[PDB]
Amino acid sequence: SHMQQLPKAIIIGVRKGGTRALLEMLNLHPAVVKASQEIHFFDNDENYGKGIEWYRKKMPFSYPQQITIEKSPAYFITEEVPERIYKMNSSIKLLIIVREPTTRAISDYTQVLEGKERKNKTYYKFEKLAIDPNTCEVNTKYKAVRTSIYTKHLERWLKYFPIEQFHVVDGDRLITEPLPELQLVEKFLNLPPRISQYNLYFNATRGFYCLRFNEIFNKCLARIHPEVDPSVITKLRKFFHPFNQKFYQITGRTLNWP
Numbered sequence: 001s002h003m004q005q006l007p008k009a010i011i012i013g014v015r016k017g018g019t020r021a022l023l024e025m026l027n028l029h030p031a032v033v034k035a036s037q038e039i040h041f042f043d044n045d046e047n048y049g050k051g052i053e054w055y056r057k058k059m060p061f062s063y064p065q066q067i068t069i070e071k072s073p074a075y076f077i078t079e080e081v082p083e084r085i086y087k088m089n090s091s092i093k094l095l096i097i098v099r100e101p102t103t104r105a106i107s108d109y110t111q112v113l114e115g116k117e118r119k120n121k122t123y124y125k126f127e128k129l130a131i132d133p134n135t136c137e138v139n140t141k142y143k144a145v146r147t148s149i150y151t152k153h154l155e156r157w158l159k160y161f162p163i164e165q166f167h168v169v170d171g172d173r174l175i176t177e178p179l180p181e182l183q184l185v186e187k188f189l190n191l192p193p194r195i196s197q198y199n200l201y202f203n204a205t206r207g208f209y210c211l212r213f214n215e216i217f218n219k220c221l222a223r224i225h226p227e228v229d230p231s232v233i234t235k236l237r238k239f240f241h242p243f244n245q246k247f248y249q250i251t252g253r254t255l256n257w258p
């Protein structure tokens with residue numbers, strides 16, 4: 001009745017799209033149980049070698065009628081993950097949360113920047129990295145940019161899973177008006193509606209929504225972005241545009257990105 005079960009839904013990406021926030025909010029649902037921290041199972045040969053059972057026992061204990069959800073942003077880009085997850089459970093449900101490509105790229109860059117300053121190291125401005133100095137065009141070799149070409153990655157995943165097993169969460173809307181996005185996830189997971197407006201409240205100070213559990217229990221989630229040359233922002237937007245249209249067409253969800 002109380003056992004460690006393999007996840008039936010995995011948030012495979014995208015980093016900086018709001019994966020942590022999505023996981024925390026879904027955890028508001030009485031039938032959802034979240035795996036603590038990222039386990040890095042499918043994207044790490046050392047751990048993947050220990051077998052599915054080691055993975056299973058890293059999951060929290062839950063009841064038969066509950067669904068365990070793991071969050072692992074790196075899975076989206078790591079080339080070998082799809083086949084491994086497919087082997088383990090070909091009917092697994094996959095969640096992808098995304099936001100405006102350019103914005104996500106800058107957020108990605110910002111985290112990498114903070115990581116280097118912490119260790120007291122040097123780094124270049126976003127522009128120097130996202131734009132080829134010579135041609136003055138978008139640098140497609142830069143991961144922050146490549147990770148934002150959502151369609152390219154989804155294509156790999158579609159080689160193993162039907163589009164029906166994926167659900168795309170609008171991360172921009174998750175920030176401004178959460179409930180509707182969470183309600184779609186509830187239906188995607190075959191869960192009855194239980195998350196309510198009472199569970200979410202806007203914190204003008206933090207600038208985001210925070211979670212409200214009990215009567216005296218509120219919880220907010222654990223960055224200052226750099227100003228980018230309006231000109232660079234414009235080139236990136238135009239660059240992503242056609243990939244964005246492909247994304248909407250494949251997923252069925254139009255996200256209205258600039």
Ligand SMILES: Nc1ncnc2c1ncn2[C@@H]1O[C@H](COP(=O)(O)O)[C@@H](OP(=O)(O)O)[C@H]1O
Binds near residue numbers: 014017019021107221
């Ligand atoms: N309620 C919330 N609290 C904090 N960040 C939220 C949020 N809802 C969405 N987010 C977004 O989640 C992003 C982090 O994504 P991930 O958890 O996948 O790394 C943040 O990027 P920024 O820090 O650039 O604003 C933030 O914009």
